[PDB]
Design a protein around this motif. Structure first.
Motif, PDB file in Angstrom:
ATOM      1  N   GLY A 123       2.918  15.379  22.623  1.00 36.23           N
ATOM      2  CA  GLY A 123       2.772  14.727  23.917  1.00 36.23           C
ATOM      3  C   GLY A 123       2.190  13.314  23.907  1.00 36.23           C
ATOM      4  N   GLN A 124       2.041  12.726  22.725  1.00 34.37           N
ATOM      5  CA  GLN A 124       1.510  11.372  22.607  1.00 34.37           C
ATOM      6  C   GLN A 124       2.355  10.594  21.617  1.00 34.37           C
ATOM      7  OE1 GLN A 124      -1.048  10.059  24.388  1.00 34.37           O
ATOM      8  NE2 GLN A 124      -1.196  12.053  25.412  1.00 34.37           N
ATOM      9  N   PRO A 125       2.430   9.271  21.780  1.00 34.32           N
ATOM     10  CA  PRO A 125       3.228   8.506  20.823  1.00 34.32           C
ATOM     11  C   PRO A 125       2.372   8.420  19.556  1.00 34.32           C
ATOM     12  CG  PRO A 125       2.030   7.014  22.185  1.00 34.32           C
ATOM     13  CD  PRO A 125       1.834   8.388  22.798  1.00 34.32           C
ATOM     14  N   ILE A 126       2.996   8.305  18.393  1.00 33.07           N
ATOM     15  CA  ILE A 126       2.222   8.192  17.161  1.00 33.07           C
ATOM     16  C   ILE A 126       1.844   6.736  16.970  1.00 33.07           C
ATOM     17  CG2 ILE A 126       2.279   8.242  14.641  1.00 33.07           C
ATOM     18  CD1 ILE A 126       4.253  10.626  14.895  1.00 33.07           C
ATOM     19  N   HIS A 127       0.672   6.503  16.393  1.00 35.33           N
ATOM     20  CA  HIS A 127       0.207   5.147  16.092  1.00 35.33           C
ATOM     21  C   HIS A 127       0.037   5.124  14.575  1.00 35.33           C
ATOM     22  CE1 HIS A 127      -0.664   3.477  20.106  1.00 35.33           C
ATOM     23  NE2 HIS A 127      -0.907   4.729  20.452  1.00 35.33           N
ATOM     24  N   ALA A 128       1.087   4.700  13.876  1.00 37.21           N
ATOM     25  CA  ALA A 128       1.091   4.655  12.420  1.00 37.21           C
ATOM     26  C   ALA A 128       0.746   3.262  11.927  1.00 37.21           C
ATOM     27  CB  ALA A 128       2.443   5.074  11.891  1.00 37.21           C
TER      28      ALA A 128
ATOM     29  N   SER B 125       0.844  -1.232   0.000  1.00 35.58           N
ATOM     30  CA  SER B 125       0.000   0.000   0.000  1.00 35.58           C
ATOM     31  C   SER B 125       0.865   1.263   0.000  1.00 35.58           C
ATOM     32  CB  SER B 125      -0.917   0.001   1.227  1.00 35.58           C
ATOM     33  OG  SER B 125      -1.755   1.145   1.242  1.00 35.58           O
ATOM     34  N   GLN B 126       0.342   2.338  -0.582  1.00 33.30           N
ATOM     35  CA  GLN B 126       1.059   3.613  -0.640  1.00 33.30           C
ATOM     36  C   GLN B 126       0.468   4.557   0.401  1.00 33.30           C
ATOM     37  OE1 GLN B 126       1.284   5.096  -4.892  1.00 33.30           O
ATOM     38  NE2 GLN B 126       0.057   3.240  -5.199  1.00 33.30           N
ATOM     39  N   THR B 127      -0.593   4.104   1.054  1.00 34.94           N
ATOM     40  CA  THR B 127      -1.274   4.916   2.043  1.00 34.94           C
ATOM     41  C   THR B 127      -1.012   4.481   3.479  1.00 34.94           C
ATOM     42  OG1 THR B 127      -3.063   5.162   0.431  1.00 34.94           O
ATOM     43  CG2 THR B 127      -3.477   5.934   2.671  1.00 34.94           C
ATOM     44  N   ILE B 128      -0.742   5.461   4.338  1.00 39.77           N
ATOM     45  CA  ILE B 128      -0.510   5.212   5.754  1.00 39.77           C
ATOM     46  C   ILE B 128      -1.592   5.965   6.532  1.00 39.77           C
ATOM     47  CG2 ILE B 128       1.960   5.209   5.282  1.00 39.77           C
ATOM     48  CD1 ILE B 128       2.153   7.841   6.890  1.00 39.77           C
ATOM     49  N   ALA B 129      -1.850   5.531   7.759  1.00 46.20           N
ATOM     50  CA  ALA B 129      -2.840   6.174   8.612  1.00 46.20           C
ATOM     51  C   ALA B 129      -2.227   6.508   9.961  1.00 46.20           C
ATOM     52  CB  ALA B 129      -4.037   5.249   8.815  1.00 46.20           C
ATOM     53  N   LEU B 130      -2.433   7.741  10.413  1.00 48.10           N
ATOM     54  CA  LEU B 130      -1.945   8.180  11.714  1.00 48.10           C
ATOM     55  C   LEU B 130      -3.231   8.237  12.533  1.00 48.10           C
ATOM     56  CD1 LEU B 130       0.503  10.970  10.592  1.00 48.10           C
ATOM     57  CD2 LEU B 130       0.923   8.529  10.927  1.00 48.10           C
ATOM     58  N   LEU B 131      -3.386   7.258  13.419  1.00 45.22           N
ATOM     59  CA  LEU B 131      -4.595   7.105  14.215  1.00 45.22           C
ATOM     60  C   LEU B 131      -4.853   8.098  15.336  1.00 45.22           C
ATOM     61  CD1 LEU B 131      -4.409   3.223  14.304  1.00 45.22           C
ATOM     62  CD2 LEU B 131      -5.548   4.699  12.636  1.00 45.22           C
ATOM     63  N   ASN B 132      -6.023   8.723  15.254  1.00 44.01           N
ATOM     64  CA  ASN B 132      -6.486   9.690  16.234  1.00 44.01           C
ATOM     65  C   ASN B 132      -5.428  10.719  16.587  1.00 44.01           C
ATOM     66  OD1 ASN B 132      -8.556   7.340  18.165  1.00 44.01           O
ATOM     67  ND2 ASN B 132      -8.746   8.162  16.083  1.00 44.01           N
ATOM     68  N   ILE B 133      -4.617  11.093  15.611  1.00 46.16           N
ATOM     69  CA  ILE B 133      -3.571  12.063  15.867  1.00 46.16           C
ATOM     70  C   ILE B 133      -4.117  13.495  15.965  1.00 46.16           C
ATOM     71  CG2 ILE B 133      -3.032  12.539  13.459  1.00 46.16           C
ATOM     72  CD1 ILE B 133      -0.004  12.428  14.408  1.00 46.16           C
ATOM     73  N   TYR B 134      -5.217  13.777  15.271  1.00 46.22           N
ATOM     74  CA  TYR B 134      -5.796  15.113  15.298  1.00 46.22           C
ATOM     75  C   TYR B 134      -6.768  15.291  16.454  1.00 46.22           C
ATOM     76  CZ  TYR B 134      -7.855  19.512  13.720  1.00 46.22           C
ATOM     77  OH  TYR B 134      -8.279  20.822  13.636  1.00 46.22           O
ATOM     78  N   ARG B 135      -6.327  16.006  17.482  1.00 49.67           N
ATOM     79  CA  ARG B 135      -7.153  16.261  18.658  1.00 49.67           C
ATOM     80  C   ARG B 135      -7.662  17.687  18.697  1.00 49.67           C
ATOM     81  NH1 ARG B 135      -4.983  12.017  20.534  1.00 49.67           N
ATOM     82  NH2 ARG B 135      -6.476  10.311  20.870  1.00 49.67           N
ATOM     83  N   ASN B 136      -8.773  17.889  19.395  1.00 50.61           N
ATOM     84  CA  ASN B 136      -9.355  19.217  19.505  1.00 50.61           C
ATOM     85  C   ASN B 136     -10.492  19.310  20.536  1.00 50.61           C
ATOM     86  OD1 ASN B 136      -9.558  21.903  18.882  1.00 50.61           O
ATOM     87  ND2 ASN B 136     -10.616  21.608  16.926  1.00 50.61           N
ATOM     88  N   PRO B 137     -10.175  19.166  21.839  1.00 52.94           N
ATOM     89  CA  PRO B 137     -11.122  19.231  22.959  1.00 52.94           C
ATOM     90  C   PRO B 137     -12.138  20.382  23.094  1.00 52.94           C
ATOM     91  CG  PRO B 137      -9.345  17.962  23.696  1.00 52.94           C
ATOM     92  CD  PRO B 137      -8.985  18.401  22.260  1.00 52.94           C
ATOM     93  N   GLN B 138     -11.772  21.523  23.683  1.00 49.87           N
ATOM     94  CA  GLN B 138     -12.759  22.608  23.833  1.00 49.87           C
ATOM     95  C   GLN B 138     -12.435  23.930  23.140  1.00 49.87           C
ATOM     96  OE1 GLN B 138     -11.417  22.003  27.480  1.00 49.87           O
ATOM     97  NE2 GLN B 138     -11.163  24.119  28.220  1.00 49.87           N
TER      98      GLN B 138
END
Lengths: 23, 98
Positions: free
Chosen positions: B89-94, B1-14
């Protein structure tokens, strides 16, 4: 601003060792 | 595959004017984030064909990032290295995403 910023206090272990403890 | 996914990396609480201001700030925060990730993808891992920051549940609170590299090779190497890095502040989940 975002890249390579470790969780406070865990700069001395690797992301893989940190993830290993997540459950 | 040529596509990768960075899981729940984009956060935005309040009114009306508050909504417009909120839309603008979210959009600017989104674009800043995008450039932040995109640039790094091209700078250290390779040529990006397509990239998108998702909104998983539709609440703008959490989202995955998908990056389609022009080269399958770059993608596979990005996943390995990214899984050894921190981000905000979080480890990446690639993960290679079929």
């Amino acid at each position: 601003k975002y890249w390579d910023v470790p969780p406070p206090g865990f700069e001395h272990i690797t992301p893989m060792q940190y993830k290993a403890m997540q459950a | 595959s040529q596509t990768i996914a960075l899981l729940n990396i984009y956060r935005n609480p309040q009114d009306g004017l508050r909504s417009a201001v909120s839309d603008v700030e979210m959009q600017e925060h989104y674009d800043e984030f995008f450039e932040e990730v995109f640039t790094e993808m091209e700078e250290k891992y390779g040529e990006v064909e397509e990239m998108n920051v998702c909104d998983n549940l539709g609440d703008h609170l959490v989202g995955n990032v998908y990056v389609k590299f022009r080269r399958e090779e770059d993608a596979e190497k990005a996943v390995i290295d990214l899984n050894n890095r921190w981000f905000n502040g979080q480890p990446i989940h690639a993960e290679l995403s079929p």
